[PDB]
Design a protein around this ligand. Sequence first.
Ligand code: P8Z
Length: 101
Amino acid sequence: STPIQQLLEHFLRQLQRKDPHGFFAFPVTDAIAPGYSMIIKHPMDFGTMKDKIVANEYKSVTEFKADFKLMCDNAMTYNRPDTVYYKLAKKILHAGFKMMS
Ligand SMILES: Cc1c(NCc2ccccc2N2CCN(C)CC2)cnn(C)c1=O
């Protein structure tokens, strides 16, 4: 594990603690979210982020932050502001960026 892998594994653990239900743990499917893949061009989830760390696909903290923001932005695009997914996406986006300083 490279230094960047160890730091991103730390950040991901801290970010997932903010999603105790694991709403963001796995990819959203069109089966449970009608039209999701037609509205969201670039899906992201914490599970895919873990796999990218393990594969050493993140070469900067900026790239990891961009995937976290994408995951949150996707939830705030597909879902209405009154929904659990939208409200948690917004909360963890701000708290996560603050946490990662
Ligand atoms: C983050 C998110 C979701 N996260 C949860 C989620 C993600 C992937 C697969 C299933 C689930 N749901 C878990 C809770 N169940 C009540 C429904 C199925 C689901 N739908 N949408 C549209 C989202 O944006």
